[PDB]
Design an enzyme around this catalytic site. Sequence first.
Site, PDB file in Angstrom:
ATOM      1  N   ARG A 176      28.108  37.022  31.470  1.00  0.00           N
ATOM      2  CA  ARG A 176      26.500  35.880  31.198  1.00  0.00           C
ATOM      3  C   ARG A 176      25.876  34.818  32.426  1.00  0.00           C
ATOM      4  O   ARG A 176      26.913  34.211  33.019  1.00  0.00           O
ATOM      5  CB  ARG A 176      26.835  34.883  29.934  1.00  0.00           C
ATOM      6  CG  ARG A 176      25.851  34.477  29.724  1.00  0.00           C
ATOM      7  CD  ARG A 176      25.612  33.693  28.597  1.00  0.00           C
ATOM      8  NE  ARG A 176      25.794  34.663  27.015  1.00  0.00           N
ATOM      9  CZ  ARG A 176      26.083  33.968  26.253  1.00  0.00           C
ATOM     10  NH1 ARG A 176      27.574  32.710  26.017  1.00  0.00           N
ATOM     11  NH2 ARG A 176      26.324  35.179  25.332  1.00  0.00           N
TER      12      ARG A 176
ATOM     13  N   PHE B   1      21.260  27.315  34.991  1.00  0.00           N
ATOM     14  CA  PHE B   1      21.476  27.086  34.112  1.00  0.00           C
ATOM     15  C   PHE B   1      22.861  27.244  34.018  1.00  0.00           C
ATOM     16  O   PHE B   1      23.919  26.590  34.870  1.00  0.00           O
ATOM     17  CB  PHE B   1      20.875  27.679  32.337  1.00  0.00           C
ATOM     18  CG  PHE B   1      19.724  27.033  32.448  1.00  0.00           C
ATOM     19  CD1 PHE B   1      19.423  26.312  31.381  1.00  0.00           C
ATOM     20  CD2 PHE B   1      18.636  28.055  32.114  1.00  0.00           C
ATOM     21  CE1 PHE B   1      18.126  25.985  30.949  1.00  0.00           C
ATOM     22  CE2 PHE B   1      17.700  28.196  32.046  1.00  0.00           C
ATOM     23  CZ  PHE B   1      17.235  27.151  31.116  1.00  0.00           C
TER      24      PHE B   1
ATOM     25  N   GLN C 122      28.216  32.098  33.215  1.00  0.00           N
ATOM     26  CA  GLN C 122      30.207  32.186  32.020  1.00  0.00           C
ATOM     27  C   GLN C 122      30.974  33.517  32.441  1.00  0.00           C
ATOM     28  O   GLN C 122      30.107  34.103  32.998  1.00  0.00           O
ATOM     29  CB  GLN C 122      29.024  32.375  30.562  1.00  0.00           C
ATOM     30  CG  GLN C 122      30.435  32.640  29.597  1.00  0.00           C
ATOM     31  CD  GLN C 122      30.090  32.510  28.300  1.00  0.00           C
ATOM     32  OE1 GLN C 122      28.785  31.740  28.392  1.00  0.00           O
ATOM     33  NE2 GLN C 122      30.303  32.214  27.541  1.00  0.00           N
TER      34      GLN C 122
ATOM     35  N   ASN D 136      32.961  28.008  24.216  1.00  0.00           N
ATOM     36  CA  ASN D 136      33.530  28.027  22.884  1.00  0.00           C
ATOM     37  C   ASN D 136      33.187  28.046  21.587  1.00  0.00           C
ATOM     38  O   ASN D 136      31.236  28.418  22.062  1.00  0.00           O
ATOM     39  CB  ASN D 136      34.454  26.405  22.296  1.00  0.00           C
ATOM     40  CG  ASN D 136      33.136  24.907  22.328  1.00  0.00           C
ATOM     41  OD1 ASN D 136      31.750  25.757  21.659  1.00  0.00           O
ATOM     42  ND2 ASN D 136      33.122  24.416  23.069  1.00  0.00           N
TER      43      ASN D 136
ATOM     44  N   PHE E 170      32.174  28.888  31.828  1.00  0.00           N
ATOM     45  CA  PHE E 170      30.743  28.557  32.858  1.00  0.00           C
ATOM     46  C   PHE E 170      30.725  27.078  33.727  1.00  0.00           C
ATOM     47  O   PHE E 170      31.636  26.489  33.763  1.00  0.00           O
ATOM     48  CB  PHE E 170      30.109  28.313  31.979  1.00  0.00           C
ATOM     49  CG  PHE E 170      29.784  26.690  31.238  1.00  0.00           C
ATOM     50  CD1 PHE E 170      30.892  26.420  30.171  1.00  0.00           C
ATOM     51  CD2 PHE E 170      28.673  25.849  31.220  1.00  0.00           C
ATOM     52  CE1 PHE E 170      30.460  25.329  29.170  1.00  0.00           C
ATOM     53  CE2 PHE E 170      28.898  24.785  30.315  1.00  0.00           C
ATOM     54  CZ  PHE E 170      29.292  24.514  30.027  1.00  0.00           C
TER      55      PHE E 170
ATOM     56  N   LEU F   3      25.029  19.418  26.143  1.00  0.00           N
ATOM     57  CA  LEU F   3      26.047  20.270  26.691  1.00  0.00           C
ATOM     58  C   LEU F   3      26.972  19.097  25.967  1.00  0.00           C
ATOM     59  O   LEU F   3      28.007  19.082  25.579  1.00  0.00           O
ATOM     60  CB  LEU F   3      26.469  21.263  27.353  1.00  0.00           C
ATOM     61  CG  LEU F   3      25.752  22.592  27.230  1.00  0.00           C
ATOM     62  CD1 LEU F   3      26.392  23.746  28.321  1.00  0.00           C
ATOM     63  CD2 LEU F   3      25.305  23.132  25.750  1.00  0.00           C
TER      64      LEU F   3
ATOM     65  N   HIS G 103      31.024  20.721  24.788  1.00  0.00           N
ATOM     66  CA  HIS G 103      32.061  21.367  25.782  1.00  0.00           C
ATOM     67  C   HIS G 103      32.856  20.332  26.603  1.00  0.00           C
ATOM     68  O   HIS G 103      31.821  19.148  27.247  1.00  0.00           O
ATOM     69  CB  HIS G 103      31.088  22.128  26.552  1.00  0.00           C
ATOM     70  CG  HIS G 103      30.566  23.569  25.510  1.00  0.00           C
ATOM     71  ND1 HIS G 103      30.864  25.038  24.949  1.00  0.00           N
ATOM     72  CD2 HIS G 103      29.355  23.437  25.178  1.00  0.00           C
ATOM     73  CE1 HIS G 103      29.864  25.533  24.211  1.00  0.00           C
ATOM     74  NE2 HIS G 103      28.542  24.222  24.197  1.00  0.00           N
TER      75      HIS G 103
HETATM   76  C1  LIG Z   1      16.443  29.158  22.727  1.00  0.00           C
HETATM   77  C2  LIG Z   1      17.366  29.727  24.374  1.00  0.00           C
HETATM   78  N1  LIG Z   1      18.464  29.253  24.448  1.00  0.00           N
HETATM   79  C3  LIG Z   1      18.322  28.800  25.470  1.00  0.00           C
HETATM   80  C4  LIG Z   1      17.674  28.214  26.599  1.00  0.00           C
HETATM   81  C5  LIG Z   1      17.497  26.649  26.555  1.00  0.00           C
HETATM   82  C6  LIG Z   1      15.781  25.952  27.592  1.00  0.00           C
HETATM   83  N2  LIG Z   1      16.334  24.011  27.265  1.00  0.00           N
HETATM   84  C7  LIG Z   1      17.774  23.588  26.647  1.00  0.00           C
HETATM   85  C8  LIG Z   1      17.560  22.205  27.296  1.00  0.00           C
HETATM   86  N3  LIG Z   1      16.115  21.463  27.115  1.00  0.00           N
HETATM   87  C9  LIG Z   1      16.385  20.625  27.899  1.00  0.00           C
HETATM   88  C10 LIG Z   1      15.801  18.688  26.725  1.00  0.00           C
HETATM   89  C11 LIG Z   1      14.658  19.325  27.599  1.00  0.00           C
HETATM   90  C12 LIG Z   1      15.392  22.035  27.551  1.00  0.00           C
HETATM   91  C13 LIG Z   1      14.705  23.774  27.273  1.00  0.00           C
HETATM   92  C14 LIG Z   1      15.357  26.537  28.259  1.00  0.00           C
HETATM   93  N4  LIG Z   1      15.499  28.422  28.456  1.00  0.00           N
HETATM   94  C15 LIG Z   1      16.907  28.523  27.117  1.00  0.00           C
HETATM   95  C16 LIG Z   1      16.933  30.908  27.251  1.00  0.00           C
HETATM   96  C17 LIG Z   1      17.259  31.284  29.302  1.00  0.00           C
HETATM   97  O1  LIG Z   1      15.944  31.395  27.049  1.00  0.00           O
HETATM   98  C18 LIG Z   1      15.991  32.522  26.191  1.00  0.00           C
HETATM   99  C19 LIG Z   1      20.251  28.188  25.721  1.00  0.00           C
HETATM  100  C20 LIG Z   1      20.684  29.191  24.668  1.00  0.00           C
HETATM  101  C21 LIG Z   1      22.441  29.309  24.362  1.00  0.00           C
HETATM  102  C22 LIG Z   1      22.621  30.032  23.210  1.00  0.00           C
HETATM  103  C23 LIG Z   1      21.726  31.201  22.068  1.00  0.00           C
HETATM  104  C24 LIG Z   1      19.848  30.813  22.754  1.00  0.00           C
HETATM  105  C25 LIG Z   1      19.963  29.913  23.933  1.00  0.00           C
HETATM  106  C26 LIG Z   1      24.216  30.333  22.900  1.00  0.00           C
HETATM  107  C27 LIG Z   1      24.697  30.752  22.088  1.00  0.00           C
HETATM  108  S1  LIG Z   1      26.400  30.490  21.628  1.00  0.00           S
HETATM  109  C28 LIG Z   1      26.515  29.438  23.355  1.00  0.00           C
HETATM  110  N5  LIG Z   1      25.303  28.841  23.436  1.00  0.00           N
HETATM  111  C29 LIG Z   1      27.332  28.324  23.007  1.00  0.00           C
HETATM  112  C30 LIG Z   1      28.156  29.780  24.077  1.00  0.00           C
HETATM  113  N6  LIG Z   1      29.196  30.293  23.115  1.00  0.00           N
HETATM  114  C31 LIG Z   1      30.572  31.440  23.302  1.00  0.00           C
HETATM  115  O2  LIG Z   1      29.614  32.213  24.917  1.00  0.00           O
HETATM  116  C32 LIG Z   1      31.702  32.095  22.833  1.00  0.00           C
HETATM  117  C33 LIG Z   1      31.331  33.890  22.392  1.00  0.00           C
HETATM  118  C34 LIG Z   1      32.531  34.357  21.003  1.00  0.00           C
HETATM  119  O3  LIG Z   1      34.091  32.838  21.133  1.00  0.00           O
HETATM  120  C35 LIG Z   1      34.016  32.789  22.100  1.00  0.00           C
HETATM  121  C36 LIG Z   1      32.790  33.182  22.964  1.00  0.00           C
HETATM  122  C37 LIG Z   1      28.627  29.105  25.581  1.00  0.00           C
HETATM  123  O4  LIG Z   1      30.235  28.144  25.380  1.00  0.00           O
HETATM  124  N7  LIG Z   1      28.411  28.855  26.520  1.00  0.00           N
HETATM  125  C38 LIG Z   1      28.538  27.899  27.455  1.00  0.00           C
HETATM  126  C39 LIG Z   1      27.342  26.498  27.963  1.00  0.00           C
HETATM  127  C40 LIG Z   1      26.121  27.475  27.442  1.00  0.00           C
HETATM  128  C41 LIG Z   1      26.262  28.174  26.663  1.00  0.00           C
HETATM  129  N8  LIG Z   1      27.130  29.564  26.909  1.00  0.00           N
HETATM  130  C42 LIG Z   1      24.692  29.338  27.404  1.00  0.00           C
HETATM  131  O5  LIG Z   1      24.858  30.485  27.860  1.00  0.00           O
HETATM  132  O6  LIG Z   1      23.025  28.734  27.244  1.00  0.00           O
HETATM  133  C43 LIG Z   1      22.879  29.620  27.443  1.00  0.00           C
HETATM  134  C44 LIG Z   1      20.932  28.053  28.159  1.00  0.00           C
HETATM  135  C45 LIG Z   1      20.257  28.936  28.955  1.00  0.00           C
HETATM  136  C46 LIG Z   1      21.927  26.796  29.356  1.00  0.00           C
HETATM  137  C47 LIG Z   1      20.888  27.632  26.623  1.00  0.00           C
END
Ligand SMILES: CCn1c(-c2cc(N3CCN(C4CC4)CC3)cnc2[C@H](C)OC)c2c3cc(ccc31)-c1csc(n1)C[C@H](NC(=O)[C@H]1[C@@H]3COC[C@@H]31)C(=O)N1CCC[C@H](N1)C(=O)OCC(C)(C)C2
Lengths: 167, 168, 163, 163
Positions: free
Chosen positions: C54, C59, C62, C101, C112, C121, C125
């Site tokens: 990922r 952002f 991962q 997580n 990540f 976060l 995390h």
């Molecule tokens: C609504 C869209 N959307 C956004 C987002 C948000 C924003 N902002 C938010 C913040 N605002 C601030 C005040 C102003 C502005 C607007 C802009 N654009 C976007 C995106 C590109 O639109 C498509 C996100 C995001 C994240 C999730 C789902 C949807 C999301 C999600 C699902 S699960 C998880 N997160 C934790 C996950 N767990 C697992 O993978 C488990 C798997 C199985 O067991 C072990 C293993 C985990 O730990 N990480 C490690 C850490 C980062 C994390 N994944 C991740 O990838 O997030 C990505 C992202 C882009 C940073 C956030």
Amino acid sequence: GMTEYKLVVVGACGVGKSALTIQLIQNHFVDEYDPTIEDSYRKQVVIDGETCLLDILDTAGQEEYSAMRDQYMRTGEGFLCVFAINNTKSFEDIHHYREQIKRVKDSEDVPMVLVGNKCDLPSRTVDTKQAQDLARSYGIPFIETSAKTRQGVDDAFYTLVREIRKH
Amino acid sequence: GMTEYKLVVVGACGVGKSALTIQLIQNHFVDEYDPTIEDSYRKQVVIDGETCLLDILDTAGQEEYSAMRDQYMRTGEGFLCVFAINNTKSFEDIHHYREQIKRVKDSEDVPMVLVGNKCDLPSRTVDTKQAQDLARSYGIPFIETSAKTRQGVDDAFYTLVREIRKHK
Amino acid sequence: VNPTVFFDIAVDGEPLGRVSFELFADKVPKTAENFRALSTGEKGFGYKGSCFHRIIPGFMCQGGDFTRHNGTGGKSIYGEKFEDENFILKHTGPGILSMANAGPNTNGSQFFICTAKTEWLDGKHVVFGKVKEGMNIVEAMERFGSRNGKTSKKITIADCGQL
Amino acid sequence: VNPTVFFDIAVDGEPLGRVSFELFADKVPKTAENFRALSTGEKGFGYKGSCFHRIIPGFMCQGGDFTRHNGTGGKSIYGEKFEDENFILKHTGPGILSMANAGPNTNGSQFFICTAKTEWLDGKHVVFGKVKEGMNIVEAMERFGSRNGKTSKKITIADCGQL
Ligand SMILES: CCn1c(-c2cc(N3CCN(C4CC4)CC3)cnc2[C@H](C)OC)c2c3cc(ccc31)-c1csc(n1)C[C@H](NC(=O)[C@H]1[C@@H]3COC[C@@H]31)C(=O)N1CCC[C@H](N1)C(=O)OCC(C)(C)C2
Ligand SMILES: CCn1c(-c2cc(N3CCN(C4CC4)CC3)cnc2[C@H](C)OC)c2c3cc(ccc31)-c1csc(n1)C[C@H](NC(=O)[C@H]1[C@@H]3COC[C@@H]31)C(=O)N1CCC[C@H](N1)C(=O)OCC(C)(C)C2
Ligand SMILES: Nc1nc2c(ncn2[C@@H]2O[C@H](COP(=O)(O)OP(=O)(O)O)[C@@H](O)[C@H]2O)c(=O)[nH]1
Ligand SMILES: Nc1nc2c(ncn2[C@@H]2O[C@H](COP(=O)(O)OP(=O)(O)O)[C@@H](O)[C@H]2O)c(=O)[nH]1
Ligand SMILES: [Mg+2]
Ligand SMILES: [Mg+2]
């Protein structure tokens, strides 16, 4: 040309939104937990004798991003509002979902379907009457599903398409 | 967080919309013709000392699908209007694209940049002052680019972002 | 003292560059040792050969699933999951290294690397490291990411160890 | 009598099923012979091992790039490209087999199978065959497509020849 229908699958995390969508699109079960960021699918089907194209947006239920659902609600035509039968909070969360879509699209008559997944589960916390009650107030149906056995999967999506055709 | 800018790259088939975009995103020149259906990209950049997130839609120039440009024109914030300097027909197609964007957006004031691509090629048919005149008559910037040499690639996309900021 | 580990990154098998991390064993010794041991592979398993599943430009990148190689697996040196150690450190900007997580106290091996500030976060995390050298390689990894994180090329940890 | 060819389709190496096509040699003998020869591989090159690189549900499945394996290549048995033979036959519905191109008179080896009526392609793409058996294989291939055609699994012609 065949008509396109934009369906949006919403609900809290882990209720089974992707497991239902993948069963419809791919006809297999995802036992592992792969949390969705955002995914889109395409599928042509015949519903009530008409060939049509389903555009399905599979969404993420994480509460931290609840302020960002406005964009995909402004583009969607119908909404599959999914809770889990063993998740009381997911049941309570449906109100904020409906009020969001009402305010985002500026209407109180938006095609929706309530889906109670994990019907196969050996537990429960949400009764079917309260589901039909809220559903009778909004004017929407309710279907019990299980992505492990594919029970009600086709019924859930097809009912929402039938609801869009009325509007 | 950082501001997100919705950029849309438009223009006739084969002018280099995808080549320009992939040079921006991947710093690599695609010399083969892979006609686009639709593609979206993301890149964070620093423009005038502030970090922002570019969301770029790569569109299809096929004329059979000209009545289907509506949805992406409604959501796009700025438009990169590309022609090729060795293709007079593509330069003439620019007028139709701008008129569409104005008609779809219901506005005379839409952030746009005019891009003359393939400026590395030895035999141009559109002259630089000719595109400069049309850009002036539109009130938009004009930049000559080459997706092959990377000339003006960053400039075209960055100038579009600057146009959008002023529109605010 | 804080150990230092390195990843040698490849793109479709072609070498891209080395990223090194300082691991904050002074604040999170348990989380830091898990990542250190998985980077050397001294326990018989670890990050070598696994991919970044990922990458979302603007952002984070991962990775860390070396058991299933689909983004759902991974395991720590302490078992399948271990507890959140603390949240002393925050997601203050690019280069932060933090544990992925699926809820409280479900740390395994997935991690990540931030490419921007991700303060929403914090408290959720466990931050345990930061890029020391090779931030340009992490930035280069973003060329193959996408909106929902699907990568357009296979980005792998060809080699890794301790410095 | 019109010749018949088959494709043996595999999904990520797993067999999916056999599709057979009737080629309209009576209406487009040059275009049919190209597809026939590429299916047998008798010229030393052809479709065996190549993939379907663009699948769009509701419309078509496209493949035939056996030279570059990225959607840009392919070649005919008469050279890299050959001319449009005629446009007598129309894209009347599912199962229609027709030639991909990049403008007039650029027929190579890339082809597409309609899963619906695509009448706006009439007069622009040379139709030269139709699915004879195994339409449900083609329909099953749709489940691995997407809006812009990118496939979620590798759909290959594991084997092919003339019946
Ligand atoms: C609504 C869209 N959307 C956004 C987002 C948000 C924003 N902002 C938010 C913040 N605002 C601030 C005040 C102003 C502005 C607007 C802009 N654009 C976007 C995106 C590109 O639109 C498509 C996100 C995001 C994240 C999730 C789902 C949807 C999301 C999600 C699902 S699960 C998880 N997160 C934790 C996950 N767990 C697992 O993978 C488990 C798997 C199985 O067991 C072990 C293993 C985990 O730990 N990480 C490690 C850490 C980062 C994390 N994944 C991740 O990838 O997030 C990505 C992202 C882009 C940073 C956030
Ligand atoms: C506007 C979006 N959009 C659509 C489209 C359209 C519609 N309809 C149109 C028709 N209306 C009905 C009468 C009312 C209703 C609305 C709905 N939704 C969509 C899609 C899903 O929105 C994302 C398309 C489409 C097609 C192109 C570009 C954009 C497109 C495109 C680029 S190049 C080409 N087309 C010809 C191409 N050439 C090469 O690949 C070259 C490679 C190198 O040199 C050899 C080799 C080729 O020969 N084929 C072999 C044949 C089908 C063809 N590909 C293809 O894929 O079309 C796909 C599709 C979806 C059928 C059409
Ligand atoms: N017992 C059971 N579990 C399910 C069912 N549907 C989904 N799950 C589980 O719920 C977990 C989360 O599924 P997921 O599709 O990711 O839910 P989402 O986050 O809303 O998209 C998975 O481990 C699934 O195996 C079901 O019908 N029955
Ligand atoms: N010499 C040269 N060729 C280019 C340039 N840009 C694009 N091309 C070529 O022109 C063809 C079409 O490029 P493409 O980006 O796919 O056109 P698009 O339909 O507008 O996206 C490709 O073979 C490219 O390699 C350029 O700046 N210089
Ligand atoms: Mg999901
Ligand atoms: Mg293109």
